[PDB]
Write a structure and sequence with these properties.
Blueprint: H1 2-17, E1 21-22, E2 28-29, E3 38-44, H2 51-64, E4 68-74, H3 78-84, H4 97-107, E5 113-116, H5 120-124, E6 131-137, E7 142-147, H6 151-160
Parallel strand pairs: 3-4, 4-5
Antiparallel strand pairs: 1-2, 3-6, 6-7
Length: about 160
């Protein structure tokens, strides 16, 4: 029975492919806990030069499209840096939760979920930079993943869905 086996295989694969997030306050969540139709995972760091402009874009898209939920994922943590070999004087020290909060208060939006990553999500989503965007729908289809997408690119993606 190929259709039956295909369906069960999907069950196993979907669960393996799934992820969870730890919020800045220490709460474990998944996609079910997120409100929008469109989920944007934004992998960033409080010192990232380009991230100020990215925050500007996400603010406007948040205001324009109520169905978007932004999850700000600061992966510039001691655990992630150690895993990646970036725990060296040539790189900034880990972001404190205070620095992360201050960045989001200054440039981002109060409705956003804030998450700090230990390198797990960096590995999961094949994150290529400190200003990296993954856009997904609620079925976990990936609509875009890439470093520093333009406003035009983001708009095009949101409009298609």
């Amino acid at each position: 029975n190929a259709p039956r086996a295909a369906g069960h295989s999907e069950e196993v694969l979907e669960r393996e492919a799934s992820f969870s997030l730890t919020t800045i306050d220490g709460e474990v969540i998944s996609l079910n806990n997120v409100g929008g139709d469109v989920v944007i995972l934004w992998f960033m760091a409080a010192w990232c030069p380009s991230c100020v402009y990215m925050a500007d874009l996400l603010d406007r898209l948040t205001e324009k499209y109520r169905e978007i939920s932004v999850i700000a994922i600061d992966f510039w943590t001691a655990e992630a840096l150690k895993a990646l070999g970036l725990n060296k004087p040539g790189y900034p020290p880990p972001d404190t939760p205070e620095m992360f909060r201050k960045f989001i208060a200054n440039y981002g939006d109060p409705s956003w979920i804030m998450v700090m990553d230990d390198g797990s999500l960096v590995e999961k989503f094949n994150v290529r930079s400190i200003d990296y965007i993954v856009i997904m729908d609620k079925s976990s289809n990936v609509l875009y993943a890439g470093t520093t997408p333009s406003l035009g690119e983001l708009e095009s993606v949101i409009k298609s869905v």
